[PDB]
Design a protein around this ligand. Structure first.
Ligand SMILES: O=C(O)[C@H]1O[C@@H](n2ccc(=O)[nH]c2=O)[C@H](O)[C@@H]1O
Length: 121
């Protein structure tokens, strides 16, 4: 009766600001985990007033901008962003993203769009 396993086949998959998200549909107030695929960048800067965003880099290479500070990232790195921190990123990467507490779109705030030409990837 308890659902323990979530598949890609049953996930919601969509493009948001230049990334391809795989939202499995985990419901758990403590944290939600999703997959992020990015070819060139996340062409939008945002922050979340409540949740920390932790990106594990499965493969590829990129650069995060966290409150405008460049943070290079490569395969096997863990990028840990606290709440209320402006986030965008460029790169060609596959990532596993944890949002803790659970992701709630009402907690996220739009700062700006970013031109696709800004990404060096
Ligand atoms: O976190 C990110 O880099 C991007 O992915 C989005 N996201 C992240 C987790 C989640 O469960 N659902 C989402 O839609 C977030 O809004 C942002 O655009």
């Amino acid at each position: 009766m308890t659902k323990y396993k979530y598949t890609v086949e049953e996930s919601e998959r969509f493009n948001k600001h230049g990334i391809d998200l795989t939202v499995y549909g985990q419901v758990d107030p403590s944290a939600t985990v999703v997959r992020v695929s990015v070819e060139r960048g996340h062409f939008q800067e945002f922050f979340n007033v409540r949740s920390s965003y932790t990106y594990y880099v499965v493969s590829g290479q990129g650069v995060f901008y966290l409150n405008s500070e460049a943070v290079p990232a490569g395969a096997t790195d863990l990028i840990t962003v606290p709440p209320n921190t402006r986030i965008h990123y460029f790169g060609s990467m596959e990532m596993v993203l944890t949002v803790a507490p659970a992701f709630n779109e009402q907690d996220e705030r739009h700062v700006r769009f970013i031109s696709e030409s800004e990404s060096p990837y």
